[PDB]
Symmetry: D2
Subunit: 277 residues, 4 copies
């Protein structure tokens, strides 16, 4: 669970005694739902970001920093910013960032990103830019997860594919049983789920505590959490309508009494929350 137990598990290569991650080790390490021959075609942005020095390997230091950035909740980014903005000028400069990398590395058992700070290393991040950077990063990793189920690069996945994903987020032969009912083709009568609608669903899981409140409020009015409540809450939380295939799959997979009301025992208490949520 710790990023140092993750790193020792997955760092498959040594150089001058020091452990290191190849590209494929890195991708395995940051896709825990898929990994507990990846035929990589391109080098993911996530890797180029994590690999600060540019030797094409992820150090312990580099992995810890990448983990840390990725683990920051969207709504707590400003707090993290103020901590890493060591001189309080409201910008993060290359040195404040390389400073962190240096310490994390020197805390390795063994013991500048041109991408963010420019070729020269002379640019800085405001809070807004830093929010944007943490966004691209989160989205990139979602893209890696997504692509396992869409190797063609179509832009979308089947409903069965979406269901495997949903199960990967769980904890399942009961949950697996429902996949049978789920389409495995994208035709006219069976639509797929877009990356965008996968990202939105991750938005919903980030705010799982707000789905929880929603279910407790409707339970009061004696309203079952049907697909219409599910739709409305997602709209409020995600700011985007869910499309039906999303909702249909969620219900199919998780509504294990088929009764049409998605309870707390059936969905909220089955999704592993995030580190600070």
């Amino acid at each position: 669970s710790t990023p140092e137990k993750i790193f020792q598990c997955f760092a498959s290569v040594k150089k001058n005694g020091e452990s290191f991650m190849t590209v494929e080790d890195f991708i395995r390490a940051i896709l825990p739902h898929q990994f507990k021959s990846l035929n990589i075609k391109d080098i993911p942005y996530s890797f180029k970001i994590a690999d600060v020095d540019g030797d094409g390997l992820i150090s312990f230091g580099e992995f810890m920093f990448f983990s840390t950035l990725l683990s920051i909740p969207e709504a707590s980014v400003p707090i993290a910013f103020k901590i890493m903005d060591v001189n309080g000028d409201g910008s993060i400069d290359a040195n404040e960032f390389n400073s962190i990398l240096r310490i994390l590395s020197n805390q390795s058992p063994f013991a500048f990103n041109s991408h963010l700070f420019g070729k020269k290393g002379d640019k800085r991040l405001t809070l807004d830019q830093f929010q944007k950077f943490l966004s691209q990063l989160r989205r990139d990793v979602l893209q890696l997860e997504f692509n396992f189920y869409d190797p063609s690069g179509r832009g979308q996945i089947s409903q069965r594919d979406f269901g495997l994903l949903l199960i990967s987020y769980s904890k399942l032969e009961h949950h697996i049983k429902a996949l049978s009912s789920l389409p495995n083709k994208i035709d006219a009568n069976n639509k797929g789920i877009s990356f965008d609608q996968f990202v939105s669903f991750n938005t919903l899981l980030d705010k799982l505590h707000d789905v929880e409140l929603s279910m407790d409020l409707y339970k009061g009015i004696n309203q079952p959490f049907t697909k219409s409540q599910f739709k409305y809450v997602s709209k409020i939380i995600c700011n985007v309508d869910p499309q039906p295939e999303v909702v249909n799959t969620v219900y199919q997979v998780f509504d294990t009494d088929k009764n049409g009301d998605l309870a707390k025992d059936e969905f909220v208490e089955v999704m592993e929350r995030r580190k600070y949520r």
Copy 2:
């Protein structure tokens, strides 16, 4: 833990077979840290709010609604608003509110607030007003907790008094042992803690997940969570400096290795979080 198990425990009076809460039952029921002869002088605002019909008793229906409103996190209020705004006009009218009360009551085992909607019942709540109302409510209950330790109405409590409070929030002879070192007088050399600074501390516990992130970020840079880190984080979260007596007491009570770094085992993992946090 459920508000219906709370209500059956505490509703000490019956009328036409139906169970009910007196003022003192109500105050016991909503101060769980203090209650698992209150000599009430005035009738608390919380009671006047919870008692919609005005018979001077809290029904099951009235207690469920009061619980529900009080349990809503500050940052999730807009979600709750949109659920209770049944006709989507962006206002909560008396009927939308009385509608909820009616259903909660009719879900009792046995089976308009002039305060919010006006004498006539003809006023409504925007989201902002609804946020304000939920605020006053949260603050009122904090005032009830506070007053147990300040019966005089001085405006402040001793550091020992503040420490008992902190322990009430825990889970303690180890934690109790430290109270010995804590002043029990408000003199010149020993200052008390104001209600304001008690409210701010509750703000800090509401965002305990952000203290958690802070501790994990400093742990990386290999910075111990000393009183200076504690100060700075509270400022970021609460938007108010903590005064020293607050910090001194927190450390005294919870820093059980006296080592000067407040760990996660020592504080974060000792405070029972809120219902959706």
Copy 3:
């Protein structure tokens, strides 16, 4: 036009060679557009409790009232001289001491947070709006006719006679087929006037799709800015009064230009 000129002109009581405002002077001064029991507004302004408003008291009240809701955090930081996140009574009465010498509890021990300060300014703004509306609701109905709303609109404007010829067309009675306008809607319409820039943006986005700014656009924009349903009668009165050329399109003249930020 400045609040010092305003104070001079409305302060009726001369005592010890200074001017002072009674309750009625103070109400006429804070309702510039338009000119029982004592208002919360007056009680807040009378820091010394002498039952009159001094020049310093009025300038202070005027300053706090001038602060736009969106900029209250900026004003809070300027007033929190020490940077501790709370406005104490010493800091709050800073202007008052200076403008006078040429909330905090009876012990003045309470410190205001930004949320509390936002709340305070909100009550203040609402009170001044109640006073302006109560000028057209003496019976205390809680609603005003369409024609009374029209006058209140013309007051907020910058009397064209055409403005005054529109009022005939507007009902002066409330009845089952001629609804009245509630206080809550008058407040909400005041929100809309705080975000008049946002209305202007929307007018450009609509013209870009060859869509003039009709009652249908006015209602939608109003809803996304105020986040509450606009009342038809408010909008009809806006169009009846301000759509001077009566083409059904409310131009940037006519309304936005006619009404800190």
Copy 4:
């Protein structure tokens, strides 16, 4: 003064009896104050990829650029015609079709969320600022002298000769004791000009404590509005250029009045 007048005046290419802008026409048009490789700005504007900017393309670009960061949610809702929380390619190219007929992926299958739209508009605004700054940084240093900053300030103004006599006093060289102004600071100063109402508020709050608006106030206000430390050299140049009467107090004339919302 309107973008239709602007387009007419700068579109140099006449073909098929319509006017069109080259890259250089387009850069001169979007940098009104002031008038290598191809800018992201031009690439976004050229929806059809013909390598020129049409009248419709330019009006569309101009509209999106005009949207203030704080009002992007309002603009998003107007553009999301169906109310589903996403702007599709059909909705986005609505204005373009209409103004022309008198992001979304190669398949145009991508839908923009509000966050993505905010991001897009942010890149656009930053690109136009880079172009304006690069006009005074040809060497690509990433910093500009104080005198070049002064000119850029005078460009944003509404040439008084006094404006031009101030520039002599300002260094035209960067050296260890005459610092230059970075792009990041020019951007941050642009934020300050977006919130000029907030600067005006602060000027009133300061006068209320008998405190004139000096470099010390200017720095503090700037910091709480932009949330980044102001550079001394930016502020000194503002005072040198705009404090026309040289009393050390930057009045509402001189600056706020001199520069939607």
